[PDB]
Amino acid sequence: ALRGLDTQFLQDNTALVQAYRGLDWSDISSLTQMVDVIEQTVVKYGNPNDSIKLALETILWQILRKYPLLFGFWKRFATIEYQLFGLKKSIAVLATSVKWFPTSLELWCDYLNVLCVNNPNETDFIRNNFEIAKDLIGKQFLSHPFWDKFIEFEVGQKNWHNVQRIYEYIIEVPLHQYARFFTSYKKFLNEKNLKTTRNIDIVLRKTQTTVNEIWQFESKIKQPFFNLGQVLNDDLENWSRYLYHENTWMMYIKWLTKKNISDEVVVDIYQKANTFLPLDFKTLRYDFLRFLKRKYRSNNTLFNNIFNETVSRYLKIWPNDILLMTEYLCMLKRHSFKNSLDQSPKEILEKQTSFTKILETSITNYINNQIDAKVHLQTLINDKNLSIVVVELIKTTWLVLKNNMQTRKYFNLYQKNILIKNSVPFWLTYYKFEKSNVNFTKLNKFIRELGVEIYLPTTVMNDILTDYKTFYLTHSNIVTYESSIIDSNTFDPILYPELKMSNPKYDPVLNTTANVDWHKKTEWKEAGHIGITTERPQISNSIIECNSGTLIQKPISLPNFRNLEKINQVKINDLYTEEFLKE
Amino acid sequence: VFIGGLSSLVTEDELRAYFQPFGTIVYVKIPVGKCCGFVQYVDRLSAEAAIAGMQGFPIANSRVRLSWGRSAKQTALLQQAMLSNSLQVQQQQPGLQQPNYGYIPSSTCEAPNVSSTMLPGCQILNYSNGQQVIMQGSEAVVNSTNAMLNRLEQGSNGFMF
Amino acid sequence: LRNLLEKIESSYSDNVENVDDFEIFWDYLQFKTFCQNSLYSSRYSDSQSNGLLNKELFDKVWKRLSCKEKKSGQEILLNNLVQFYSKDTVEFVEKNIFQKIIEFGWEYYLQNGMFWNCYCRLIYFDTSRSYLDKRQYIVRKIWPQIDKKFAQSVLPSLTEFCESYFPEEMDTLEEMF
Numbered sequence: 001a002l003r004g005l006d007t008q009f010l011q012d013n014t015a016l017v018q019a020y021r022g023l024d025w026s027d028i029s030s031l032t033q034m035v036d037v038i039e040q041t042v043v044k045y046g047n048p049n050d051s052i053k054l055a056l057e058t059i060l061w062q063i064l065r066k067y068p069l070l071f072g073f074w075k076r077f078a079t080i081e082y083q084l085f086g087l088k089k090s091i092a093v094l095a096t097s098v099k100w101f102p103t104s105l106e107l108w109c110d111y112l113n114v115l116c117v118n119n120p121n122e123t124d125f126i127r128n129n130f131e132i133a134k135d136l137i138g139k140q141f142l143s144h145p146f147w148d149k150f151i152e153f154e155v156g157q158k159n160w161h162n163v164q165r166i167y168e169y170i171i172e173v174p175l176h177q178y179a180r181f182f183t184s185y186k187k188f189l190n191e192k193n194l195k196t197t198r199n200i201d202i203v204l205r206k207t208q209t210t211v212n213e214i215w216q217f218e219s220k221i222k223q224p225f226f227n228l229g230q231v232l233n234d235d236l237e238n239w240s241r242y243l244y245h246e247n248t249w250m251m252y253i254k255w256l257t258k259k260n261i262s263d264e265v266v267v268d269i270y271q272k273a274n275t276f277l278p279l280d281f282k283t284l285r286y287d288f289l290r291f292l293k294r295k296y297r298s299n300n301t302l303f304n305n306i307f308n309e310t311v312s313r314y315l316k317i318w319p320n321d322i323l324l325m326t327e328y329l330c331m332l333k334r335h336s337f338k339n340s341l342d343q344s345p346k347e348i349l350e351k352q353t354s355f356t357k358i359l360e361t362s363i364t365n366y367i368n369n370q371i372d373a374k375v376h377l378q379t380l381i382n383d384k385n386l387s388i389v390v391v392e393l394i395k396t397t398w399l400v401l402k403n404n405m406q407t408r409k410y411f412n413l414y415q416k417n418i419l420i421k422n423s424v425p426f427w428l429t430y431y432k433f434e435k436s437n438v439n440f441t442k443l444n445k446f447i448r449e450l451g452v453e454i455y456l457p458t459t460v461m462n463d464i465l466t467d468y469k470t471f472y473l474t475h476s477n478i479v480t481y482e483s484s485i486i487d488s489n490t491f492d493p494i495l496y497p498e499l500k501m502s503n504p505k506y507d508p509v510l511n512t513t514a515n516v517d518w519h520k521k522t523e524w525k526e527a528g529h530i531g532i533t534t535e536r537p538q539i540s541n542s543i544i545e546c547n548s549g550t551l552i553q554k555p556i557s558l559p560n561f562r563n564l565e566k567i568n569q570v571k572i573n574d575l576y577t578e579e580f581l582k583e
Numbered sequence: 584v585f586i587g588g589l590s591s592l593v594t595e596d597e598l599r600a601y602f603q604p605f606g607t608i609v610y611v612k613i614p615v616g617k618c619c620g621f622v623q624y625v626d627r628l629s630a631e632a633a634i635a636g637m638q639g640f641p642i643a644n645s646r647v648r649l650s651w652g653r654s655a656k657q658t659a660l661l662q663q664a665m666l667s668n669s670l671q672v673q674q675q676q677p678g679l680q681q682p683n684y685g686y687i688p689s690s691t692c693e694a695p696n697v698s699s700t701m702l703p704g705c706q707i708l709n710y711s712n713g714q715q716v717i718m719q720g721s722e723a724v725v726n727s728t729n730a731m732l733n734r735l736e737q738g739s740n741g742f743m744f
Numbered sequence: 745l746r747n748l749l750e751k752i753e754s755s756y757s758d759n760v761e762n763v764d765d766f767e768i769f770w771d772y773l774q775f776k777t778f779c780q781n782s783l784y785s786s787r788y789s790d791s792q793s794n795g796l797l798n799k800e801l802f803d804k805v806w807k808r809l810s811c812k813e814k815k816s817g818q819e820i821l822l823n824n825l826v827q828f829y830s831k832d833t834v835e836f837v838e839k840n841i842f843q844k845i846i847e848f849g850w851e852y853y854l855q856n857g858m859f860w861n862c863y864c865r866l867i868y869f870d871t872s873r874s875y876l877d878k879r880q881y882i883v884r885k886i887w888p889q890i891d892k893k894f895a896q897s898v899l900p901s902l903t904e905f906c907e908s909y910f911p912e913e914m915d916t917l918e919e920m921f
Contacts, residue, residue, distance in 0.1 A: 297915070323741070400875050422644065580658075721764060725766045
């Protein structure tokens with residue numbers, strides 16, 4: 001996670017391979033391994049990829065150099081130095097050359113040719129075609145770049161009118177008109193490009209990111225959207241991301257929805273950004289799950305695969321989020337059965353029961369530390385995420401199958417598990433189950449055990465206590481009520497929730513011996529100041545309770561004291577310093 | 584309030600669920616890998632009500648041990664001193680500049696035009712989860728109960744936790 | 745307690761349902777319910793007491809609901825009308841509110857997603873119905889009664905019911921709106 005350490009290690013290893021003056025296969029393999037690990041760790045800005053490409057080229061490995069060009073083009077959009085580095089490479093080639101270099105040139109054109117600095121790519125491709133007899137292809141390339149706005153576009157038009165000396169005027173109107181519109185668009189974007197080039201340099205300041213000029217350029221690009229402005233928008237988003245602010249991608253999300261580009265181009269954007277953008281951010285990711293579930297409307301196994309794998313990644317990088325297992329289980333119930341209620345009654349119940357069996361056998365293996373790679377759910381289920389899985393087993397068993405006894409059996413079986421022992425949806429589903437069946441006896445025992453044994457959060461506790469107070473007032477009567485208080489302990493369904501609301505540990509205990517054991521309790525030792533336990537002096541036998549009329553009978557005994565040595569002794573266990581600052 | 588002894592299986596939105604009812608929160612952070620978080624309220628009465636309210640209360644089957652502790656920036660100012668063992672001069676939290684006749688400490692605005700009577704019984708001002716809002720006594724109860732009945736239906740099916 | 749409820753309903757001239765502040769009408773109405781459950785023997789099978797369905801209190805509730813946008817409580821009073829979970833009472837609450845409110849056709853209650861969500865959850869938690877007539881009843885009748893112009897407001901809340909309980913039929917929901 002340290003960039004300067006990996007840079008110092010790369011420079012030291014490379015200076016070891018060069019300073020050693022030999023190939024030094026240990027140092028060469030060490031340099032390659034360090035480069036691969038650093039590339040796996042980091043986004044590999046153009047400079048270190050240039051140094052790594054130079055080092056691999058010095059070692060002279062052709063195929064390995066072909067792979068590191070594709071891995072260099074893996075992380076970047078807008079780099080013409082890597083593409084031109086491959087065309088300079090791949091310009092020296094073998095039996096597949098002719099078609100190989102035009103493939104790399106054509107793909108590099110698909111990517112970076114719409115950029116403002118992109119003139120050298122068109123120059124190199126025109127030079128590569130001019131090296132051949134391909135002059136038709138050179139005229140095609142010359143006609144293609146004239147339609148795009150570039151910095152040097154005028155000099156390119158004059159070079160085309162110059163080397164065009166054979167076929168030059170062949171089509172004058174289309175070429176001159178397209179060149180004129182391209183010049184107008186270039187003149188229009190010259191103000192944004194000027195505000196850019198007058199902004200970006202590294203001060204380690206907002207100038208370096210040029211976030212303001214990038215925001216204005218993206219705003220001008222999105223509102224004035226015409227033709228290639230999809231590829232202009234992607235190019236501008238890429239160049240903006242090259243300097244990890246995700247409100248830029250969060251600007252692009254609406255840009256591709258409004259301009260109506262096909263789903264194939266949009267899903268790849270989020271597939272690249274989810275990897276690019278750092279972990280722990282997690283807004284556009286959920287919006288991408290929502291995009292997949294939304295585009296599922298037109299049914300494609302592609303979106304089901306992208307969803308299943310994407311959830312497989314996010315659940316690994318975020319194990320604690322429970323929403324992912326609810327979404328994934330919803331899509332598993334959805335795409336893998338699809339009853340549609342046109343079928344036979346015996347068929348749909350089979351499709352439900354099969355789901356129940358896969359789910360029960362899934363959690364049964366998950367608790368026993370047995371994993372079946374054939375069932376994908378087994379990979380996803382987690383110690384935190386097992387809860388809602390059992391919960392949807394309950395819900396499907398009781399609601400869909402109308403089987404009550406199996407369901408109550410599942411409550412007892414799964415009530416003692418340590419993982420789902422404390423669960424919000426499990427005990428809310430039990431609260432809704434014991435609400436549906438109207439019996440209060442189970443549900444009273446539910447709410448009186450809620451602070452002692454079954455531990456939920458306090459906001460949810462207030463919720464069960466209030467909602468059950470209302471439910472009990474509405475659906476019960478007095479004859480049921482007054483029979484319901486044992487009186488061994490003080491408990492009433494109307495009043496007790498009101499005393500227990502903000503207090504999870506409230507115990508209605510009636511005892512006189514709490515008076516005898518008093519003043520040794522931490523609540524006494526800290527009273528006016530919390531967290532700090534003083535020992536406070538007091539008179540053992542104190543008269544302030546006895547009225548002065550009752551004192552005159554007998555002479556008052558002398559005061560007996562206690563805790564009188566400790567008046568200046570005030571102790572604090574410091575729990576912030578020693579368990580956090582000290583670690 | 585520094586809350587130590589967590590399970591580190593717990594999220595921050597779950598911890599908010601624990602410490603929400605004791606009062607309005609201006610939250611700080613929960614450290615990663617340190618298995619101890621901390622919370623911050625607006626008023627000390629709510630803080631003490633949370634410390635006395637939850638002490639030894641298990642979260643994910645771990646008895647929680649919580650006491651007083653500072654915020655993130657003062658934590659940084661301390662940790663830079665712990666290595667250089669120099670001073671560790673504390674700086675107390677800012678006060679509320681107190682008169683305030685409209686605010687009733689340890690009270691929450693459960694959700695978001697109000698022209699009120701500004702009478703004593705009602706809660707005039709309040710905080711938002713950073714915007715000072717005037718609390719409407721009639722609409723606040725129906726809003727809080729609305730979010731209460733939503734939290735059950737979303738909570739049972741796994742959306743809210 | 746019942747005397748004091750008489751005193752607080754006499755404060756408003758025997759309209760608590762028209763009060764501006766909802767907490768008084770609600771706290772009054774639920775404790776009033778708890779009393780008339782004990783006074784009058786249950787009218788319905790399965791022995792369920794009639795808590796909020798009674799000629800005295802149900803007219804109060806319906807008068808509270810007829811005011812629509814002007815009075816605050818609304819859905820909170822409606823959510824508790826779904827709590828009955830039986831045959832007789834799902835028929836009663838089906839016909840006497842959720843049906844009449846469609847016939848009179850008020851716009852506030854139809855644009856609302858809580859209304860349709862609760863009118864789905866009332867049929868869906870019935871113990872008398874099987875799964876087939878339950879899902880078929882929700883899809884074939886409850887859903888098409890929604891107007892497509894209301895959909896934008898109705899879809900978010902009514903999706904949350906269909907997303908959790910009916911993942912299978914989620915598509916025919918999306919095709920409607």
